[PDB]
Amino acid sequence: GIIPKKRQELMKWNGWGYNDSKFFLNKKGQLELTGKRYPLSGVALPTFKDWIQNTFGINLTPPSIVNEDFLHELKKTNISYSQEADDRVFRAHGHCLHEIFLLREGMFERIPDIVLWPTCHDDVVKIVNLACKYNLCIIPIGGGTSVSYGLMCPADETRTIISLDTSQMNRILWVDENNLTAHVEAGITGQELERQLKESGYCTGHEPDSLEFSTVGGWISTRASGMKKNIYGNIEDLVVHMKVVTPRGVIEKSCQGPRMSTGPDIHHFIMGSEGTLGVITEATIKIRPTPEYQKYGSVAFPNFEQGVACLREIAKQRCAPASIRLMDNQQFQFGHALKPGFDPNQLSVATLLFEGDREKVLQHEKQVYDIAAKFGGLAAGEDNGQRGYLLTYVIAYMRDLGLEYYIIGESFETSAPWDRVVDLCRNVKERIRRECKEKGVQFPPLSTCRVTQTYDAGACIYFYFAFNYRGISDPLAVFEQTEAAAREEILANGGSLSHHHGVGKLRKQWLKESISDVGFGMLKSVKDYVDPTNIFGNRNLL
Amino acid sequence: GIIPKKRQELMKWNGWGYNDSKFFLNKKGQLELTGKRYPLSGVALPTFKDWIQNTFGINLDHKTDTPPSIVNEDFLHELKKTNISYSQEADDRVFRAHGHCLHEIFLLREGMFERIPDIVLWPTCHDDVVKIVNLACKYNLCIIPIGGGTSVSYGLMCPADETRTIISLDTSQMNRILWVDENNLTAHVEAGITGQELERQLKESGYCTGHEPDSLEFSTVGGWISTRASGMKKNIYGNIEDLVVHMKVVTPRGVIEKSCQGPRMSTGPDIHHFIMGSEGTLGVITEATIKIRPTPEYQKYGSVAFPNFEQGVACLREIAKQRCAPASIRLMDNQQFQFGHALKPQVSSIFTSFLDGLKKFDPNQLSVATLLFEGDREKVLQHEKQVYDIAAKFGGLAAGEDNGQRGYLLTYVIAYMRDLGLEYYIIGESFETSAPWDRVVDLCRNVKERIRRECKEKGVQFPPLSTCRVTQTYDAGACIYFYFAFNYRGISDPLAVFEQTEAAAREEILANGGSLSHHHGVGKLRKQWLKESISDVGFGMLKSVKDYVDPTNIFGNRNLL
Ligand SMILES: Cc1cc2nc3c(=O)[nH]c(=O)nc-3n(C[C@H](O)[C@H](O)[C@H](O)COP(=O)(O)OP(=O)(O)OC[C@H]3O[C@@H](n4cnc5c(N)ncnc54)[C@H](O)[C@@H]3O)c2cc1C
Ligand SMILES: Cc1cc2nc3c(=O)[nH]c(=O)nc-3n(C[C@H](O)[C@H](O)[C@H](O)COP(=O)(O)OP(=O)(O)OC[C@H]3O[C@@H](n4cnc5c(N)ncnc54)[C@H](O)[C@@H]3O)c2cc1C
Ligand SMILES: C/C(=C\c1ccccc1F)C(=O)NCc1ccc2[nH]c(=O)[nH]c2c1
Ligand SMILES: C/C(=C\c1ccccc1F)C(=O)NCc1ccc2[nH]c(=O)[nH]c2c1
């Protein structure tokens, strides 16, 4: 999983993922994913077309402005660079819906002027120094998977914009098997990181759904959350050490002690900084011996409410498996539709992934079914759970499909206290229906949720919103506005601005209310100290 | 659990803890703790005296005004109108001019502080703290918050050249539990509540935080947050940074508070971490929400002996490797094992030597781990079996719940032993670090040797007591806790000698890959290593926050920076 410099060689220039992976109608008229990459690749999905048709009512470049002394100086460094249109455009965006439109059927207002590929910490230092000398703006990019407009170049940035691409700074530097830590360069992808560690019998277990492309550096910048955080932690639990290149100089602690009291933890000044302060060049991450065994599972509940109560109880007992997700009825129908009692309009389903030693797994599993049983939960099968999880890496490919048929969609997320979850889900799902009907959407949108992570004090709730934009004169406007209304509803119902996606430029307008005016001023004060001239000018957060 | 305004009524004006609790020689000549507060209170310790004598070479029988209150009269008038209680009394000011570092206790015992608070205030709620901070801006006052007064980093010491009126802003009357959210398992509390009072009140509704630092009788929620406190049972409950879900902070710039109680967010750098570890330099933490748990149904103590310390460390490391650490596991070195042996009740022969006594009862090599499990009875007992099976693989032999039980009770009594030692020319202090697993054994060996070399070089006559234990396990390493003591007779400046040996031990720790601090923090004791520890830029970032939040340095204890 090493991303080539010319990403378009391997990855779609106008959508998610690998060129060799796209949904298509096979020779029996059923949807199937092309290629051989995924466990679902080449697997007929006989009832998927039907689900779609039912749900959605369908039938189925600016020049590079660059100082020449800067270019001359960059040449002496031997850092690879490009002023080519296709390289700059590829890095002008992440994976928000509006972005994917300007990429497809249009053009962006502002794209990087020059792409650089540092291969190490010292190259990054050179680049930041050049940027100070020539007054250049740096927007770091790893995987390019931001869903927060975090990579968008500000339209009125008139400095030369360097896309500082970390994909070629991608080595494991050392694996410390005495301490179970691995020190890595921050451009390594999740997939490559896990592939290499596995060969030595280790894993990080950090598995965001973006792992094929998202990077260590990206995870730390956005406070990324992984599917197995219950065992391995989120990124703030995984990172033991980091090295950061700012215009002021290099941030690094002098020791690898597991926990300190040496004033406010400066690691948390950089985590969540969203490329506004400097470049995370290296990090030390906790590793674990690869689990012996993995088992999937599922549980049906009479309704969503009972499911929530069961996840809560599971959280209260602190016996969550590696992953536990609760799907509302719509997502359950969706899952059922991708295969190769109770009131059925409200029936909910949890999917389970257990991992560890086989005997402890088996024992754990029994415990979880016994708890579920007390909330009306019924074992619903391993193959079901397993399919739910094997879907994880393909959903991203479904947009491109949808777009071909005038279906537009996006997911969004929040975290909320346990006592707000049920109301928040209902109220947000209802708000989306209402806004859509009021803006002229002809068919009630898909408006669905799942509880995706559990904590002592609450849960991450993950929503999908999508609609057939038939007979709508401004579909992107309608979409933007409804998604902003959804957000408003989430905040009204006690939900957070973001669980894991981050703020970028998409949720900027709510940050000050979320963290307080003095909080905002604290973030500003660090920004102005570390980067007084705003070299790191993506304008995320603040 | 409530700390009274005139603390010296309940607590010792000149040393640790409650007035009713000191070590004395009983009518048999045995050391015993007065009072009835602890399980060991009124329990004779017949070999303790022998151990003291053998360790420090003393006989034991042979024993061992103030600056005026400078305060503006208009401020005083405005303060009278708020009905916030206050005091300019010297006993009230002196009590809050220090924590529990050795030098501070010396200056109490045989001297005077260079600088003490000019006035003490007792806010009773968040709005009172806002009014006080408003007045400090208006009259240009310096505020040093105090909760428990249990700092071991010079974090409460008033800087000698601070010429502004110093307010000791005592949080002890802001001690309520504001709500208990049983749906989300969180409690929202005022910051001056002590750990003992917090646990007692919560247990009445069936809950606990399980945050149990050895100072919990006096240390407060606000204290814990300021200093990144670590508790004995963090393996179950977390350290303070895992326990806090929410906080409210009064700064000169305004009030910090997030607008929601979501369990985990990605909304930029986590500003809770700007506050955690701020050591009273930014503002007053007035309230916090803390995760709670059902009170555990059952506790099980235990102990395991290993052939040596190194085998004990390998065992703890494997326990950490399989992520099955109990509520608490602590590995003591052989000297601490001997010490523990010397606080038991069976009266030995005066003619059989102690070392031979102990041996009859390699005993100069053996190390002992003490253990606490708590939770559901079923799970606790399965878990204990699991840990004891791992320990068997490293030569570990079960050593009795009795010793585990005694180990855990001693934790709250040891602090009273300073007061005792100071009566007999013995000074010492504990200190700590965290370190990667692969540095632990070498670090411990090397620090103990440095301390021996340094004492000898500085004229100390007896070899110092210099002992260690591993008090916490993490995935990436351990917390190491040291005790250092010596008889100071024949030394001309014993504080200088201690001070300089302490600093040299610290240099040795850092040179062995240890941290500057695991939990005690920086205060004004470790400031000179801080830049080196967190980098020049990282230091500049803390300074940028201080300069923004507290531009005129109202929170002027001068800790950290
Ligand atoms: C299909 C899909 C699935 C996803 N699943 C998850 C998930 O399960 N969990 C999750 O948390 N998120 C998820 N995301 C969001 C995204 O993957 C994460 O936010 C991820 O952490 C971004 O990593 P990246 O390397 O792609 O960063 P990029 O998108 O390249 O950059 C993100 C931000 O960080 C900055 N940045 C990048 N590298 C560095 C660096 N080395 N130093 C300093 N700043 C830098 C950038 O300037 C930018 O502001 C998903 C996204 C998609 C599109
Ligand atoms: C015998 C003994 C045992 C100990 N055991 C432990 C232990 O197990 N674990 C551990 O981590 N530490 C321990 N300590 C150290 C100490 O108790 C902790 O650092 C504790 O967190 C301090 O709490 P406090 O309420 O006593 O704070 P104080 O000592 O009163 O204050 C400490 C610092 O925080 C500031 N402060 C206090 N309250 C506030 C507030 N509300 N807002 C802003 N700033 C504030 C003060 O200005 C000062 O800088 C121990 C100390 C002793 C003497
Ligand atoms: C864009 C999209 C879905 C979609 C497609 C068509 C119609 C409607 C939609 F919501 C989608 O899910 N992409 C995968 C994705 C995105 C962000 C994620 N965050 C996670 O934690 N995991 C993430 C996964
Ligand atoms: C000072 C001392 C013991 C002592 C007494 C006389 C001579 C030498 C000494 F080292 C001691 O341990 N006090 C209790 C104490 C202090 C700080 C602690 N921090 C912890 O985590 N736990 C703490 C416990």
String of DSSP letters for B99-137: -S-HHHHHHHHHS--S---SEEEE--SHHHHHHHHHHHH
Contact criterion met (CB < 8 Å) for A256 and B436: yes
Residues facing residue B480 across a β-bridge: B433, B470
CA-closest residue to ligand 3 atom 23: A209
Residue A158 assigned as binding residue: no
Measured CA distances, A201 to A211, A213, A335 (Å): 19, 22, 33
Give the list of residues 6+ apart from residue B514 with CB closer than 8 angstroms, or none.
A255, A257, B433, B434, B435, B439, B443, B447, B480
Question: Any idea of the CA torsion for A295, A296, A300, A305, to the nearest 10 degrees?
Answer: 100
Q: What is the 3-state secondary structure (H, E, C) of A446-475?
A: EEEEEEEEEECCEEEEEEEEEEECCCCCCH
Task: Give A5 Cα–ligand 1 centroid separation in angstroms.
Answer: 18
Contact criterion met (CB < 8 Å) for B321 and A264: no
Distance CA B511, CA A94 (A): 45
What value does the CA radius of gyration of chain B take, rounded to a whole number of Å?
24
Give the list of residues 6+ apart from residue B461 with CB closer than 8 angstroms, or none.
B57, B487, B489, B490
Measured CA distances, A1 to A88, A194, B308, B467 (Å): 22, 10, 46, 50
Distance CA B391, CA B322 (A): 12
Residue A266 assigned as binding residue: no
C-alpha B518 chain-centroid distance: 11
Distance CA A280, CA A266 (A): 13
**CA B181, B184, B185, B189 torsion-angle sign:** negative
Measured CA distances, A472 to A400, A466, B234, B426 (Å): 20, 14, 56, 85
Kindly state the DSSP code that residue B211 receives in the 8-state scheme.
Answer: -
Nearest to A482 by CA among A217, A93, A97, A11: A97
Distance CA A93, CA A145 (A): 8
Instruction: Tell me whether residue A12 is exposed, middle or buried, using C-beta atoms within 10 angstroms of its C-beta: 0 to 12, 13 to 18, 19 or more.
Output: middle
B270 Cβ closer than 6 Å to some ligand 4 atom: no
Q: What DSSP string runs through A498-523? A: -SSS--TTTSGGGHHHHH-HHHHHHH
Ligand 3 atom showing the smallest separation from residue A408 Cα? 7
Distance CA A116, CA A168 (A): 10
Using an 8 Å Cβ cutoff, are A16 and A33 in contact?
Answer: no
Using an 8 Å Cβ cutoff, are B194 and B218 in contact?
Answer: yes
Contact criterion met (CB < 8 Å) for B521 and A261: yes
Here the contacts of B133-140 (C-beta below 8 Å, separation 24 or greater) are B133/B250, B133/B251, B133/B252, B133/B283, B133/B284, B133/B554, B135/B75, B135/B78, B135/B79, B136/B167, B136/B252, B136/B554, B137/B252, B137/B552, B137/B554, B138/B75, B138/B78, B139/B72, B139/B74, B139/B75, B139/B165, B140/B164, B140/B552
Q: What DSSP string runs through B406-439? A: HHHHHTTTTTHHHHHHHTTTEEEEEEEEEEEGGG
Which residues of B are annotated as part of the binding site? Answer: 145-151, 214-220, 227-230, 279-285, 418
Distance CA B517, CA A234 (A): 25
Distance CA B280, CA B258 (A): 20
Angle CA(B51)–CA(B52)–CA(B54) in degrees, nearest 5?
65
B396 Cβ closer than 6 Å to some ligand 2 atom: no
Q: Which amino acid is at B326?
A: P
Nearest to B541 by CA among A270, A182, A139, A87: A270
Distance CA B510, CA B507 (A): 5
Using an 8 Å Cβ cutoff, are A286 and A366 in contact?
Answer: no
Q: Which amino acid is at B400?
A: G
Q: Where are the beta strands (DSSP E) in A123-252?
A: 137-141, 161-165, 172-176, 181-185, 202-203, 239-246, 249-251
Residue A237's Cβ-side half-sphere holds a number of Cα atoms within 13 Å equal to 20
Distance CA B394, CA B312 (A): 7
Give the list of residues 6+ apart from residue A484 with CB closer than 8 angstroms, or none.
none
Give the list of residues 6+ apart from residue B192 with CB closer than 8 angstroms, or none.
B3, B147, B170, B171, B172, B173, B174, B175, B220, B221, B222
B197 Cβ closer than 6 Å to some ligand 4 atom: no
Instruction: Extract the tokens encoding A509.
Output: 């307008």
Distance CA B309, CA B171 (A): 42
Q: Where are the beta strands (DSSP E) in A328-445?
A: 348-356, 378-379, 407-417
Distance CA B26, CA B36 (A): 15
Distance CA B40, CA B23 (A): 11
Instruction: Extract the tokens encoding B156.
Output: 């409460």
φ and ψ of A125, to 5 deg: -60, -45
Interface of A with B in 267-306 (CB under 8 A): 268-274, 286
A540 Cβ closer than 6 Å to some ligand 1 atom: yes
Residues facing residue B294 across a β-bridge: B207
Distance CA B207, CA B199 (A): 8
Structure solved via: X-ray
Using an 8 Å Cβ cutoff, are A312 and B185 in contact?
Answer: no
Give chain A's domains with CATH numbers.
1-19+61-169 (3.30.43.10), 20-60 (3.30.160.650), 170-290 (3.30.465.10), 291-393 (3.30.70.3450), 394-501 (3.30.300.330), 502-542 (1.10.45.10)
Q: Where are the beta strands (DSSP E) in B316-457?
A: 328-332, 367-375, 397-398, 426-436
Give the list of residues 6+ apart from residue A129 with CB closer than 8 angstroms, or none.
none
Kindly state the DSSP code that residue B165 receives in the 8-state scheme.
Answer: P
Residue B79's Cβ-side half-sphere holds a number of Cα atoms within 13 Å equal to 25
Give the list of residues 6+ apart from residue B353 with CB closer than 8 angstroms, or none.
none
Instruction: Extract the tokens encoding B500.
Output: 């300089």
